Coordinates of C-alpha atoms in Angstrom, one line a residue:
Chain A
X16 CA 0.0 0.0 0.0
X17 CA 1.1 3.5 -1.0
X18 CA 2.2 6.3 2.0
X19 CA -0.1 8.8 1.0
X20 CA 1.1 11.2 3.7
X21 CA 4.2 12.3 3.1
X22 CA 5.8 13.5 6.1
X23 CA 3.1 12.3 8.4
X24 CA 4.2 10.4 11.4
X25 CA 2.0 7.4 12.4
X26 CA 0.8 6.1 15.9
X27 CA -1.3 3.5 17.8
X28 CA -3.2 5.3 20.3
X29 CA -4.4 2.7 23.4
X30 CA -7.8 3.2 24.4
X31 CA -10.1 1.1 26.6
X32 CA -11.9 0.1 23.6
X33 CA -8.6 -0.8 21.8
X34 CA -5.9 0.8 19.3
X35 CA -6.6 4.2 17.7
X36 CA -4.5 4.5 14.2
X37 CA -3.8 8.0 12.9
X38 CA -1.2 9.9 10.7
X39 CA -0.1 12.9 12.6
X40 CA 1.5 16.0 11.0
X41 CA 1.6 19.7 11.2
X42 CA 2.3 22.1 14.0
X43 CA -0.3 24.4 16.0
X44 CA -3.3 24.1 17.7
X45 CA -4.6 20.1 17.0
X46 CA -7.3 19.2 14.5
X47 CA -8.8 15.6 14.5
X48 CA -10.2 14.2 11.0
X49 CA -12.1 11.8 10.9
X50 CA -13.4 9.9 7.6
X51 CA -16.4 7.5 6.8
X52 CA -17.9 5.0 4.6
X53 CA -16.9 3.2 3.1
X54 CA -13.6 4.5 3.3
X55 CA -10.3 5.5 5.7
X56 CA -8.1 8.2 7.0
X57 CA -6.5 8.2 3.6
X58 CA -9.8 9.7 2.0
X59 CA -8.0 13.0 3.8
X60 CA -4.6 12.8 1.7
X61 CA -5.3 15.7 -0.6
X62 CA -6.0 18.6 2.2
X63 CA -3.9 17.6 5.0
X64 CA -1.0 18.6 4.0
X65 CA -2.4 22.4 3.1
X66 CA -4.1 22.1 6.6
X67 CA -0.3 20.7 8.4
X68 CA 0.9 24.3 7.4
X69 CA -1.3 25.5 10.6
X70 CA -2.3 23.1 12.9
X71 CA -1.1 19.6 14.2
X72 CA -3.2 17.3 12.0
X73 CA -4.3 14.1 13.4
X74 CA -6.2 11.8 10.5
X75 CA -8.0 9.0 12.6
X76 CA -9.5 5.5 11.4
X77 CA -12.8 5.2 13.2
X78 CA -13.2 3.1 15.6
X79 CA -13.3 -0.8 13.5
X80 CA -12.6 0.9 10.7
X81 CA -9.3 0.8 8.6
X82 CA -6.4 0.0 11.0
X83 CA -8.4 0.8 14.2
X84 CA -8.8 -2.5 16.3
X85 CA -12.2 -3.9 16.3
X86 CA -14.1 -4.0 19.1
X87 CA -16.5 -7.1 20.1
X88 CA -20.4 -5.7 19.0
X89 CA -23.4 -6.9 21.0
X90 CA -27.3 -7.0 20.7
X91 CA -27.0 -3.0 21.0
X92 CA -24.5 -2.7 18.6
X93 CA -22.8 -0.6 21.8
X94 CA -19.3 -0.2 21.0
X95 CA -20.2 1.5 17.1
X96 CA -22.9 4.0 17.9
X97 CA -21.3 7.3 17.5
X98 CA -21.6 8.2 21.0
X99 CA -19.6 5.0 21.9
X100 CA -17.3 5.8 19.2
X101 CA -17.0 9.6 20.2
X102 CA -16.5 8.2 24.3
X103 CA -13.1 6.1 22.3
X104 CA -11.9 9.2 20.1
X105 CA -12.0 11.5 23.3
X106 CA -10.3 9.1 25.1
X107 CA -7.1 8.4 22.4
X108 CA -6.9 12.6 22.0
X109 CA -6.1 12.6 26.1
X110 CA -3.5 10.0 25.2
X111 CA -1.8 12.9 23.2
X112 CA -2.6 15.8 25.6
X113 CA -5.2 17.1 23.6
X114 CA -8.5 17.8 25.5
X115 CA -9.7 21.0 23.5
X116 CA -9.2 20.9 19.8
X117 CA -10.7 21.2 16.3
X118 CA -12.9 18.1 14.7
X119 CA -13.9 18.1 11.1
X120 CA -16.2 14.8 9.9
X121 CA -17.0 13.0 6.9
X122 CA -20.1 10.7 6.6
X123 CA -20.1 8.4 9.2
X124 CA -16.9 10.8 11.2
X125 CA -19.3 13.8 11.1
X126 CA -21.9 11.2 13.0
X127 CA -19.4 10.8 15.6
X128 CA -18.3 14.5 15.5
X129 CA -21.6 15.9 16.5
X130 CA -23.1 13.6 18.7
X131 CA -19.0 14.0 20.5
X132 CA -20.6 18.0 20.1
X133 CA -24.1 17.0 21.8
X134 CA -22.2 14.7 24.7
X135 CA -19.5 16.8 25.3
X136 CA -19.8 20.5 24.2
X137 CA -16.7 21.3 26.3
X138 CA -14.5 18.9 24.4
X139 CA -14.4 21.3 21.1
X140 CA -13.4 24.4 20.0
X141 CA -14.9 24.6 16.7
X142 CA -16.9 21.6 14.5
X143 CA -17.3 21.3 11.1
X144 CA -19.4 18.5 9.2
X145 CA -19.1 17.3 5.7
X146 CA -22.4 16.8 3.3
X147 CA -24.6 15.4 6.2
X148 CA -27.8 15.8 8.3
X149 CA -28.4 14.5 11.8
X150 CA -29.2 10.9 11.8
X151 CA -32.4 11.8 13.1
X152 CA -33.4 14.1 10.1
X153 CA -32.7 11.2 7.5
X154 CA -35.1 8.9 9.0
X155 CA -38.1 11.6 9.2
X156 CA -37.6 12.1 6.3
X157 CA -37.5 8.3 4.7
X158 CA -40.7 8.8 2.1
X159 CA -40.5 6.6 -1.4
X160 CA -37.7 8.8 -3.2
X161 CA -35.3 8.9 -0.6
X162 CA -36.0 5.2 0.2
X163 CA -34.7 4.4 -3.2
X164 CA -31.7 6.9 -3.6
X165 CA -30.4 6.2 -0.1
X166 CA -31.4 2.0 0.1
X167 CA -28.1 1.0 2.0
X168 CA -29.6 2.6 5.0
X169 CA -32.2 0.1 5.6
X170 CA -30.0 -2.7 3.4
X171 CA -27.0 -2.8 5.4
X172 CA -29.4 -1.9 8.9
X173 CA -30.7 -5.9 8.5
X174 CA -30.0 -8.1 10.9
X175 CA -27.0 -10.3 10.5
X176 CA -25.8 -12.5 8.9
X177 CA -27.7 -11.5 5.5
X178 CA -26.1 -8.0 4.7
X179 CA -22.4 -9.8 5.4
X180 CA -23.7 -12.9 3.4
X181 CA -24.8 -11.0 0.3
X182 CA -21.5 -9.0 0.0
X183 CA -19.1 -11.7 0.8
X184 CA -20.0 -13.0 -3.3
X185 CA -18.1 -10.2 -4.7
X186 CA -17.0 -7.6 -2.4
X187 CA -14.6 -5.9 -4.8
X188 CA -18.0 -5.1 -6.6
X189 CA -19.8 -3.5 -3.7
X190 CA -17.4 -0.7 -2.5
X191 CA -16.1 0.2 -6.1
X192 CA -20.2 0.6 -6.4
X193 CA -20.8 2.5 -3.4
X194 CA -17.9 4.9 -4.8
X195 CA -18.3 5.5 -8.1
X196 CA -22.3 6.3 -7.7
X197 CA -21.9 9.5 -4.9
X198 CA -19.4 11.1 -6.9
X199 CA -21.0 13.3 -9.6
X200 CA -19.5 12.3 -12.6
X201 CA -20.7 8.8 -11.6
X202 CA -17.2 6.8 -11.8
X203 CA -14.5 6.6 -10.0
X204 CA -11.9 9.1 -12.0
X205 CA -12.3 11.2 -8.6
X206 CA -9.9 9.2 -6.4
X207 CA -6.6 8.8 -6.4
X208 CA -6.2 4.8 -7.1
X209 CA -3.7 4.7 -4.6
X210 CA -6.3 5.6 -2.5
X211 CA -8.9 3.1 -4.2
X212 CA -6.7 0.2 -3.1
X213 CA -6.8 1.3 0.8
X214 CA -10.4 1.2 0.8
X215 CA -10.5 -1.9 -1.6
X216 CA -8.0 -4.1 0.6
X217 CA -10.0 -2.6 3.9
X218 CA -13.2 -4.0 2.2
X219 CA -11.9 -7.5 1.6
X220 CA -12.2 -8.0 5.0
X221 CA -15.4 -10.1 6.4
X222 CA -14.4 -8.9 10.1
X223 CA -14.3 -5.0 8.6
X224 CA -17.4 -5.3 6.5
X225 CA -19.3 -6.9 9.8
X226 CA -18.5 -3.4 11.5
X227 CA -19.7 -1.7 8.5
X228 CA -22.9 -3.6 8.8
X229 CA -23.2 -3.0 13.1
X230 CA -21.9 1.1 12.3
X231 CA -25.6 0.8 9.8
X232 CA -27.2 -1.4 12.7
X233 CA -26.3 1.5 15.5
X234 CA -27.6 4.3 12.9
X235 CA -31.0 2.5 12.4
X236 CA -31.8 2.1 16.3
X237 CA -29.7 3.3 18.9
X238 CA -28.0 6.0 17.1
X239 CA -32.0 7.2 16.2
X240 CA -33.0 7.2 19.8
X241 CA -30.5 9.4 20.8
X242 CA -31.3 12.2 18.5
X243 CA -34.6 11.5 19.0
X244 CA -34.1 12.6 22.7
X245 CA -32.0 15.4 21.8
X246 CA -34.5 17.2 18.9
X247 CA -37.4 16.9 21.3
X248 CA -35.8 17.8 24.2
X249 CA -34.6 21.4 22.1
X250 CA -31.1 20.5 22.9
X251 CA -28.8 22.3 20.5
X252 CA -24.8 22.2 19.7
X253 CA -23.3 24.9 21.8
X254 CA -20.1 25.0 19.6
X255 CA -19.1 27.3 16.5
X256 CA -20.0 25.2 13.7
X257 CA -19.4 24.8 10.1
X258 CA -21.4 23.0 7.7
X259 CA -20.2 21.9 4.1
X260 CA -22.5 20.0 1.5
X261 CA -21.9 19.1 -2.1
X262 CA -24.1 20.2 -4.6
X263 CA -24.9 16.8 -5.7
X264 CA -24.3 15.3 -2.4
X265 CA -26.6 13.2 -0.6
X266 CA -27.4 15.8 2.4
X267 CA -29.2 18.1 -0.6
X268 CA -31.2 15.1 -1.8
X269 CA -33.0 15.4 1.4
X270 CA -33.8 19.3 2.6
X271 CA -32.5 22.3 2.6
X272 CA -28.7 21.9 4.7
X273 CA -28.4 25.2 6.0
X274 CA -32.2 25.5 7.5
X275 CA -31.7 21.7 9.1
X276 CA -28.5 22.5 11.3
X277 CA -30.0 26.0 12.0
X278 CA -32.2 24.0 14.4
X279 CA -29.8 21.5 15.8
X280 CA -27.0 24.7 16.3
X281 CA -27.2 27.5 17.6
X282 CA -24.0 29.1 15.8
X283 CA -23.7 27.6 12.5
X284 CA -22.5 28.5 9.1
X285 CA -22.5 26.4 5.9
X286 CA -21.5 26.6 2.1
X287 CA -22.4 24.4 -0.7
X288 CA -19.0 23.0 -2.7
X289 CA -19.7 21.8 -6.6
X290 CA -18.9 18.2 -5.9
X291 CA -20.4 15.3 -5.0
X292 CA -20.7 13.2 -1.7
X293 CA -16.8 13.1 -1.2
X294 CA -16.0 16.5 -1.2
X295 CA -12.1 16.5 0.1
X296 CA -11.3 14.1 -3.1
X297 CA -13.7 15.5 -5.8
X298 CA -13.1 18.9 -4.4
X299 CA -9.5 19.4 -2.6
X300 CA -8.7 23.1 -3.0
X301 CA -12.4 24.4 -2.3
X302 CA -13.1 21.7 0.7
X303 CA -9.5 22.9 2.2
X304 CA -9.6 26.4 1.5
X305 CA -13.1 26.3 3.5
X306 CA -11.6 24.2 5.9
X307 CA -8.9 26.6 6.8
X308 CA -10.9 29.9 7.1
X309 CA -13.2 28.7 9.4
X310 CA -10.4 26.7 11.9
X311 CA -8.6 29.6 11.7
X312 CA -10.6 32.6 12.1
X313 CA -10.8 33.5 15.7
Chain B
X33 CA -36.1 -34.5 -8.8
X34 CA -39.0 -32.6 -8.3
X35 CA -41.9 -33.7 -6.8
X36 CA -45.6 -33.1 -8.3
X37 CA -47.1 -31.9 -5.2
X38 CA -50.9 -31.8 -7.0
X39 CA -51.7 -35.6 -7.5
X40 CA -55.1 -35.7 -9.9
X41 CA -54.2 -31.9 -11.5
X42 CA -53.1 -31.8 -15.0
X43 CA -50.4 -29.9 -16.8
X44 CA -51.0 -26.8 -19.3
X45 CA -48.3 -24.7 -21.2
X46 CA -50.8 -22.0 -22.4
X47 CA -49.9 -19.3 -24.8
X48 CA -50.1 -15.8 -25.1
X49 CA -48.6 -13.2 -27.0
X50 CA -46.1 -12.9 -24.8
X51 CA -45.1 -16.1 -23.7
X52 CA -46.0 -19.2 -22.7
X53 CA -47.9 -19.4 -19.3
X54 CA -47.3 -23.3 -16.7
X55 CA -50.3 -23.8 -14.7
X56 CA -51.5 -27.2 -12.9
X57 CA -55.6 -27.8 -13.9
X58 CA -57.6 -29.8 -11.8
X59 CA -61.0 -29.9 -10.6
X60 CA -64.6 -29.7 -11.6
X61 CA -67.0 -26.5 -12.2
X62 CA -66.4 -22.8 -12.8
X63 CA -63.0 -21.0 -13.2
X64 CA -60.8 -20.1 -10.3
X65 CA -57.4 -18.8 -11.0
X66 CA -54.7 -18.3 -8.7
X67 CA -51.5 -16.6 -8.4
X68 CA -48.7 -16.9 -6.3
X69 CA -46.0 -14.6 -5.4
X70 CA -42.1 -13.4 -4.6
X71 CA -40.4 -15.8 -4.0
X72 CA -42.3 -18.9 -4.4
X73 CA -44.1 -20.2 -7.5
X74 CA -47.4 -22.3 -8.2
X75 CA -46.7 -25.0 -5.8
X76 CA -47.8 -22.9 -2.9
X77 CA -51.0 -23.3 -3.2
X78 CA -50.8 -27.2 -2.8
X79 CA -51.8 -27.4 0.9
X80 CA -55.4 -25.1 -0.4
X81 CA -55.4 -26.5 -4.3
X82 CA -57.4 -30.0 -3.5
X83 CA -59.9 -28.7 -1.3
X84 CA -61.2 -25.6 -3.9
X85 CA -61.2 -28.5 -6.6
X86 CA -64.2 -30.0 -5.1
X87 CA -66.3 -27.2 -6.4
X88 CA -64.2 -25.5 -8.9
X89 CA -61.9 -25.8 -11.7
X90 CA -59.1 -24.7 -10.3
X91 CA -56.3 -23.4 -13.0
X92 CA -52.9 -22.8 -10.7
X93 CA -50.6 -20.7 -12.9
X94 CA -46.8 -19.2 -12.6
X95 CA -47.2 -15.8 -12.8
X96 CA -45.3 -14.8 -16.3
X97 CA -41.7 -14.5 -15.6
X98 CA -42.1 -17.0 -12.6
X99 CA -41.5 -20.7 -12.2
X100 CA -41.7 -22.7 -15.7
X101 CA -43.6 -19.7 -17.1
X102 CA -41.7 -18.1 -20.1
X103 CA -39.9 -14.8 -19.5
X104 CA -41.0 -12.0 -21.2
X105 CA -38.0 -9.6 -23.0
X106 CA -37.9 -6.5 -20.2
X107 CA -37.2 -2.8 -21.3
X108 CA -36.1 0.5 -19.8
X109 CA -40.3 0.6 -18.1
X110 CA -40.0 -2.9 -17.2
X111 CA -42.7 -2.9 -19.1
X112 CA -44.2 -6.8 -19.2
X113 CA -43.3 -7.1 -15.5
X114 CA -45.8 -4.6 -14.5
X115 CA -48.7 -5.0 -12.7
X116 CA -50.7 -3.9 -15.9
X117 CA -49.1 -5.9 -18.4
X118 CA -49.0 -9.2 -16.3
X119 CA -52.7 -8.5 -15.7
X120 CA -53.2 -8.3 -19.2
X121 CA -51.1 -11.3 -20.2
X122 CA -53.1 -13.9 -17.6
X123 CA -56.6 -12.4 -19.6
X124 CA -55.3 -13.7 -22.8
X125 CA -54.3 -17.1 -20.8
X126 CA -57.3 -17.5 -19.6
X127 CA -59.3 -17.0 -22.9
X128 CA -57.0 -19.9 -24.8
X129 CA -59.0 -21.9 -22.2
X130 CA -62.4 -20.2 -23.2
X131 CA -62.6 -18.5 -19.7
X132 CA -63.4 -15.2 -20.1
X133 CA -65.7 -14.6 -16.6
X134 CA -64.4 -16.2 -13.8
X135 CA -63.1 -16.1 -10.3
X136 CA -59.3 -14.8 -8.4
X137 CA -57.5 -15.4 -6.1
X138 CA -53.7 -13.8 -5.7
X139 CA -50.7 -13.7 -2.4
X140 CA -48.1 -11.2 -2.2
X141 CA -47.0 -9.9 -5.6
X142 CA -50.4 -12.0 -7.4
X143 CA -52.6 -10.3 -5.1
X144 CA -51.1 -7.2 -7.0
X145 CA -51.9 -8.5 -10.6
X146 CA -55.2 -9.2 -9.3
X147 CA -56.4 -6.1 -8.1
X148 CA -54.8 -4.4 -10.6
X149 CA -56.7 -6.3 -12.8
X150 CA -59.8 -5.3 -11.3
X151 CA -59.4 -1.9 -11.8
X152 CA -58.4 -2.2 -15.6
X153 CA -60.5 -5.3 -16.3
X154 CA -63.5 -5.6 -13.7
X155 CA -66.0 -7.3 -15.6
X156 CA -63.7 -10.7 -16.2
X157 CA -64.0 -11.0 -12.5
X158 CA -66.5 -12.3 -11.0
X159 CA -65.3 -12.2 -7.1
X160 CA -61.9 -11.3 -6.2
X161 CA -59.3 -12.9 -3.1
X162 CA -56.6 -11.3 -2.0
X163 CA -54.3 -12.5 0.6
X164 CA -51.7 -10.3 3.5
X165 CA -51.2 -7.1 0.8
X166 CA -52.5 -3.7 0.6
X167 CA -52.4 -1.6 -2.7
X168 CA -48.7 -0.9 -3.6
X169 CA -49.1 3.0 -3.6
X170 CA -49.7 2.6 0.1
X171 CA -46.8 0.9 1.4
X172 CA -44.8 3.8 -0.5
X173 CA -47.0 6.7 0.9
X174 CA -46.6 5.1 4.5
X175 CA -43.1 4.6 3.8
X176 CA -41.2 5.7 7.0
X177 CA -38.1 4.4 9.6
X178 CA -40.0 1.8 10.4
X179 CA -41.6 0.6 7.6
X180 CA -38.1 1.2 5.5
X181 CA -36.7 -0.8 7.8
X182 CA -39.4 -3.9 7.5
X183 CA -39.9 -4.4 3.3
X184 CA -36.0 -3.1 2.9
X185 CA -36.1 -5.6 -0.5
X186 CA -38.6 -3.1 -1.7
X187 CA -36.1 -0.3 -1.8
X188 CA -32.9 -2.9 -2.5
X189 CA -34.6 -5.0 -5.2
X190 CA -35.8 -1.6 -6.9
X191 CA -31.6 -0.7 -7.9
X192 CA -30.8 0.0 -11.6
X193 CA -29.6 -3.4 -12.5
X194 CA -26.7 -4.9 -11.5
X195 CA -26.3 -4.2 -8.2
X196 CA -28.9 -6.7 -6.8
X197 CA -29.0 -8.9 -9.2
X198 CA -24.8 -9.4 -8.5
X199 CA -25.7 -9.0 -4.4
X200 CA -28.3 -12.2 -4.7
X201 CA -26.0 -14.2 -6.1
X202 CA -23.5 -14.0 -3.7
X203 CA -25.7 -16.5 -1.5
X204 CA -28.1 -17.5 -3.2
X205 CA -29.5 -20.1 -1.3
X206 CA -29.4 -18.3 1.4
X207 CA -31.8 -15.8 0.6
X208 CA -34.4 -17.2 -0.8
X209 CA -34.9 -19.4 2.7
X210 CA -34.0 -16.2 4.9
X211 CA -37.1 -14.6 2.6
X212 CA -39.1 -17.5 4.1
X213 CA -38.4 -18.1 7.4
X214 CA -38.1 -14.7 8.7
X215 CA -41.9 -14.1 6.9
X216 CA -43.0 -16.7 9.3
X217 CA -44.4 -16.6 12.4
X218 CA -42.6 -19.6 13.5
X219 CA -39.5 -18.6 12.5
X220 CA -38.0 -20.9 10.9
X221 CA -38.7 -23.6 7.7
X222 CA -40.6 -25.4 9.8
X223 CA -44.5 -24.6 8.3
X224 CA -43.2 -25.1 4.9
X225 CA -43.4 -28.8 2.9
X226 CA -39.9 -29.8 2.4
X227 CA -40.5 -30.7 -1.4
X228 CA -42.1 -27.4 -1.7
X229 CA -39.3 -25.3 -0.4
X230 CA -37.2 -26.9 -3.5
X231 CA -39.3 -25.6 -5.7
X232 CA -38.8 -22.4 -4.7
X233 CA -34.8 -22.8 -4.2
X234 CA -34.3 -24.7 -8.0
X235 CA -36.3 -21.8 -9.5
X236 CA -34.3 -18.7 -7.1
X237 CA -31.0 -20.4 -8.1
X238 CA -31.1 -19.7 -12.1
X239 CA -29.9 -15.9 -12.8
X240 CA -32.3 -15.0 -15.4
X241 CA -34.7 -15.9 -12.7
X242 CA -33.9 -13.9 -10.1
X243 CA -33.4 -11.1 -13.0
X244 CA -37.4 -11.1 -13.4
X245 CA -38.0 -10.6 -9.8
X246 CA -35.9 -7.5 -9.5
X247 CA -37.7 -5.9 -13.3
X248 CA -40.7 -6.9 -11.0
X249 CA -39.8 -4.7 -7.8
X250 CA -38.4 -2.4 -10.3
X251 CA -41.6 -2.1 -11.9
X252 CA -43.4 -2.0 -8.6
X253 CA -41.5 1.1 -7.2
X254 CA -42.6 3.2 -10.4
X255 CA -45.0 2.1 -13.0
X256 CA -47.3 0.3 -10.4
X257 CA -47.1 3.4 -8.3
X258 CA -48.3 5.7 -10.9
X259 CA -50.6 3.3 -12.0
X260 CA -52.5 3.2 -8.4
X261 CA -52.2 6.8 -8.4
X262 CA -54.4 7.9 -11.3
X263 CA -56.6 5.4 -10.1
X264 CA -56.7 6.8 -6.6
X265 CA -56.7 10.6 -7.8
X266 CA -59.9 10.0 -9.6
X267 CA -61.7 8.1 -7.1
X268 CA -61.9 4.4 -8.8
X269 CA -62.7 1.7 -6.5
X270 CA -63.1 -1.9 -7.1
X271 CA -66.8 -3.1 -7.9
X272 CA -66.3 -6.8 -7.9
X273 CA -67.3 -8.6 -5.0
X274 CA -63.6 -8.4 -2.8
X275 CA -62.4 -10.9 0.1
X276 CA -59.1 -9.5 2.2
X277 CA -57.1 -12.1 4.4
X278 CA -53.9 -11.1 6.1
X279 CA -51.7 -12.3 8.7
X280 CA -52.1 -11.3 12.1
X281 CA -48.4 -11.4 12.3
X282 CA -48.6 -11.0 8.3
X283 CA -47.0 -7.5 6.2
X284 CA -50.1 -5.7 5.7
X285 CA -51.0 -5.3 8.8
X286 CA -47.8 -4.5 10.4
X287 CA -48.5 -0.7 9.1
X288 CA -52.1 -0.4 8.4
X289 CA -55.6 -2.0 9.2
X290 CA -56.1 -4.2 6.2
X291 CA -60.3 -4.1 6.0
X292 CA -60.0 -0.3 6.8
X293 CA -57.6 0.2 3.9
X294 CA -59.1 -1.4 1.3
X295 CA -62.6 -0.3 2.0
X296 CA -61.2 3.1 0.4
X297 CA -60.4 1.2 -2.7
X298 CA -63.3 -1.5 -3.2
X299 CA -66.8 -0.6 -2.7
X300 CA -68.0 -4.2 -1.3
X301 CA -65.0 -6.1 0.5
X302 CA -65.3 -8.4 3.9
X303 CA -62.2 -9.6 5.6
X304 CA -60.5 -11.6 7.9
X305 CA -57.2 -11.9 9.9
X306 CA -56.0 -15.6 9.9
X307 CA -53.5 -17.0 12.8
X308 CA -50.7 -17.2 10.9
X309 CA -47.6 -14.9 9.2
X310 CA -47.1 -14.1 5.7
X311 CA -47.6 -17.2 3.7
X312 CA -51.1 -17.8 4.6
X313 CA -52.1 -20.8 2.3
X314 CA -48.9 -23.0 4.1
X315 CA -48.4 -21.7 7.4
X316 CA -52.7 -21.9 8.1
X317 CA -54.0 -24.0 5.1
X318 CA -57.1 -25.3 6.3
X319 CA -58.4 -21.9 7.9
X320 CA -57.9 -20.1 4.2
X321 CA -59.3 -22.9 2.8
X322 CA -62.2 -22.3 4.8
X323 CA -62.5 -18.7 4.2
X324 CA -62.0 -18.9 0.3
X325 CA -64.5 -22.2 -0.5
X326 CA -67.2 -19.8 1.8
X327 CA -66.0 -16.9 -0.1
X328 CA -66.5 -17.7 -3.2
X329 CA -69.1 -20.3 -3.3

């Protein structure tokens, strides 16, 4: 497999849930990463390094994800709902002295990164989410059309083993897919192929595509609930807050990104980017250029 | 190797201008058809089949596409696979036998061809079964979490083509008896006739097969839908006689009150729950027996 960060150091960070992996780079105030599905910390290779000119830059596999160890799941799916996940993340950034920093998300990482925002505000100093909406605001909003344009929600949400089952046939198949379709151009000229092997060789894994399946379980049930108490409880995120959609991007597809977080933060800005779902690989320069501005502005 | 579960019933290959159409014939008297659906074929009426042929002839068909029926050439509508055109196809069928009146009963996706035929066709009817569905455009307007996450393969088997079609055969097998079993309310395979469950396996198990079962979910996420909505836009109900059964641990009623539901679309419709999960005519055979041979006769 190809080093994709240059420069980068790498670490296992111990945490009572197991091994952390992250490239670290940069100097300044620290900024965590985080990536999702179906993908790894490599899915970051493109704007770290214009972000390592300011800030230490950790780039994090999620929990199960990547080179992360992979925690036992049970009949709650505990250990991969994102406000397990966000307990493990805090725990590895006290390993490395951080306990106040930056956190930007992608897909599943910007779960983690705001519910880490609802559980524990004091934790950040400033949060920015890439091309989602709460967990809770894709399922209220699950009529015929967005059934059929987001299906892997409910797919991958059935109770095992059929999901693993079904993509053990052909895996290579499935995450070249999964891809190729959120990207706008609809292929998969977007990505580095150095990069397409990490998240190819990650996918060939039963064990790593079980904890894709239990990350899909956790979003359909227990990951639900706890919004659900959040929204109707009027509990908002305290913390400055960026949010960044693509144009094409599955977050659009839904409502209106800007007027969504409005009600879930209480000091939030957002942008569109023209790209699609994976907006640091279809759109580098933009996605860090946005990136940088808002970490860095106060 | 597989076993003719309907001793005393013949064997038609009936044809149509569309294909060929298998259906077991037996019985004595006027016309009941009956249809099957996803993902068994004709054989799972054999537990019911015997007892209706004492007062009727009783013409058991595979649904076109299905079983040992021929399989239609799809397009970019899925045209032949939907609701409409199948509906269509089984009136031509039934007229190469010189039935041209006569009486329906469907489950699951030939409960949809039959009231779908209704509406399009409602004086070839004269009374009208159908068992543990309601109208297609309401599972989609009641489509929610929880209902998302129940009929899932409505959403999955309703891709652009490959992507399911390469996902089912990964395991083949192995869906088609998850499909059953977890339908069930025991569980498990255990209501199901051993010989019958091959049936069902041999015929998931050939790829072209399991092609015409995703052209028909395909079909049933958009033509079907806009068919039921003109239909329900313009105030049509059913005005053939109409008998609903469903599960009391069955699909339809898992989001809805069945008799409430349809009594928007039919104007005269009586029904009944039945102690049993989704496969009615297997899992309680002799209490849908009793319902239909009442119902009909």
């Amino acid at each position: 497999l190809a080093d994709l960060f240059p420069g980068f150091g790498s670490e296992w960070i111990n945490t009572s849930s197991g091994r952390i992996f992250a490239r670290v780079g940069g100097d300044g105030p620290p900024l965590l990463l985080l990536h999702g599905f179906p993908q790894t910390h490599v899915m970051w290779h493109r704007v770290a390094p214009k972000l390592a000119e300011r800030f230490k830059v950790i780039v994090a596999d999620l929990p199960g994800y990547g080179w992360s160890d992979m925690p036992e799941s049970d009949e709650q799916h505990t250990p991969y709902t994102k406000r397990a996940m966000a307990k493990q993340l805090i725990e590895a950034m006290e390993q490395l002295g951080h306990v106040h920093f930056a956190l930007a998300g992608h897909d599943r990482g910007a779960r983690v990164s705001y519910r880490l925002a609802l559980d524990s505000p004091g934790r950040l100093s400033k949060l920015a989410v890439l091309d989602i909406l709460p967990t809770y605001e894709y399922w209220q909003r699950m009529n015929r059309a967005y059934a059929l344009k987001i299906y892997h929600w409910s797919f991958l949400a059935q109770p095992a083993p059929l999901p693993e089952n079904l993509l053990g046939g052909d895996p290579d198949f499935y995450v070249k897919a999964k891809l190729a379709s959120w990207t706008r151009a609809g292929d998969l000229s977007a990505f580095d192929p150095r990069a397409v092997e990490h998240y190819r060789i990650a996918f060939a894994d039963p064990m790593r595509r079980h904890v894709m399946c239990e990350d899909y379980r956790a979003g359909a049930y227990a990951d639900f609930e706890h919004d659900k108490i959040d929204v109707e409880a009027g509990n908002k995120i305290p913390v400055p807050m960026l949010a960044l959609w693509g144009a094409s991007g599955i977050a659009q597809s839904a409502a209106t990104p800007l007027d969504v977080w409005r009600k879930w933060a209480s000091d939030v800005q957002g942008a569109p980017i023209e790209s699609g779902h994976f907006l640091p690989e279809e759109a580098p320069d933009q996605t860090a250029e946005a990136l940088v501005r808002f970490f860095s502005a106060a």
